[PDB]
Amino acid sequence: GLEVLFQGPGSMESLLSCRGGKSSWPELVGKEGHIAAATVERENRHVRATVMREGSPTTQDFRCDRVWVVVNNRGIVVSPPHIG
C-alpha cells in the first residue's frame, strides 16, 4: 500500500513501496502500549511493533516494516503509531 517519496539531499527523488494495507493507527492513541502493539501486528502482518518511551533519540532512517508504539511514563500511547 504505502508509497513514500523522499525529496533527498539535493533534487534527489526516491520511492519506498511498503508492503501491506494499514500504515497509521489513530484509534490506538490512549490505549496501553501492549494492546496497541498487538493490534498493529494483527492488522498488518508485514510490520514489527516495538514499544518506545516518548522523545528517545530517533535513528535517522525510515523502515517500511517498523511501527514505533510511542508511550508516556504510564505505558499509554501518546501519538498515532505509523510505519517508519
Side-chain angles (χ1 to χ4, degrees), residues 2-64:
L2 187 77
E3 293 169 30
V4 185
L5 292 155
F6 285 93
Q7 276 153 333
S11 54
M12 199 138 288
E13 300 288 301
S14 58
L15 186 93
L16 308 177
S17 277
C18 309
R19 213 325 190 191
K22 207 176 179 170
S23 70
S24 186
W25 287 267
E27 77 277 11
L28 286 188
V29 177
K31 298 214 172 331
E32 304 88 325
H34 73 81
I35 292 297
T39 298
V40 167
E41 287 190 354
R42 188 162 48 240
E43 291 178 8
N44 193 336
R45 293 296 190 201
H46 307 284
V47 304
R48 309 150 170 184
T50 303
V51 177
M52 190 172 70
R53 197 182 256 138
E54 254 171 313
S56 41
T58 154
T59 168
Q60 288 319 281
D61 56 17
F62 186 108
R63 290 172 192 285
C64 283

Side-chain angles (χ1 to χ4, degrees), residues 61-80:
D61 56 17
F62 186 108
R63 290 172 192 285
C64 283
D65 66 3
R66 178 175 64 199
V67 174
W68 287 128
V69 181
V70 184
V71 294
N72 61 22
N73 341 325
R74 272 65 93 258
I76 301 302
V77 180
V78 297
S79 156

